[PDB]
Design a protein around this ligand. Structure first.
Ligand SMILES: [Cl-]
Lengths: 135, 137
């Protein structure tokens, strides 16, 4: 498998990126609760997930468009990019030197929308990939 | 192949997590409307709860597969607990109880269950990441 291996790697990185997103949200939330509970928040875990996500985006770019339709490949990288630059990077910065209401409003609306868009792109990418492999 | 099976499991787990986070937001908006003296629409929250339940069933059907049996088990038990003890009550309580129930249950009981699911999901992602990226030593 050469094309097959490439596809599976694209599916793998895409899944890993989406997973790092959930790790990031969950870890940032934990740290944020400690801040709300009059504590000292440790943002090293969440920053780790954020970086992991960006590195998986770099790994995805190096693999794309690969063997599939270049459009869906373009789609996934631009929505991944957006989720990072407009969602996760600003949301992290709000938790670190922003107000509580600004971080919570952004984390309850802005970042989610970007998440569902990237998630949608990822699901169609993987459905198309899976179909080709199962031919 | 092993990579595809792990990835299907990682994808079902993320989808489960996404559907759970959705559920919490979905239900909250329906309650603001109910608290605002309006006619709530529970159809969407029910959809998320049902999607969370469907993703658990799909996770079980794929497990343990190539993943360590202990980690696989932790994930399914914490997922199932979050659903049967956290999520389901909230929904049944949101359709009958008060702030003393749905709001109080959701702030005290659920979080603990949510936190355990998150710890298991981390344990899963870490081992999967090591297998997939040949990162282990
Ligand atoms: Cl591309």
């Amino acid at each position: 498998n050469d094309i097959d291996r490439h596809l599976v790697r694209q599916m793998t990185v895409l899944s890993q990126g989406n997973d790092q997103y959930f790790r990031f949200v969950t870890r940032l939330s934990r740290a944020m609760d400690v801040k709300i509970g009059g504590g000292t928040p440790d943002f090293a875990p969440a920053r780790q997930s954020l970086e992991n996500m960006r590195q998986k985006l770099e790994e995805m770019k190096a693999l794309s468009p690969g063997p599939m339709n270049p459009d869906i490949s373009r789609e996934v990288l631009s929505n991944w990019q957006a989720l990072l630059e407009k969602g996760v990077v600003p949301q992290m910065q709000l938790a670190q030197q922003g107000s509580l209401t600004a971080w919570s409003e952004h984390a309850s609306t802005v970042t989610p929308a970007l998440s569902r868009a990237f998630g949608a792109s990822a699901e169609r990418f993987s459905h198309e990939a899976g179909a080709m492999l199962d031919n």
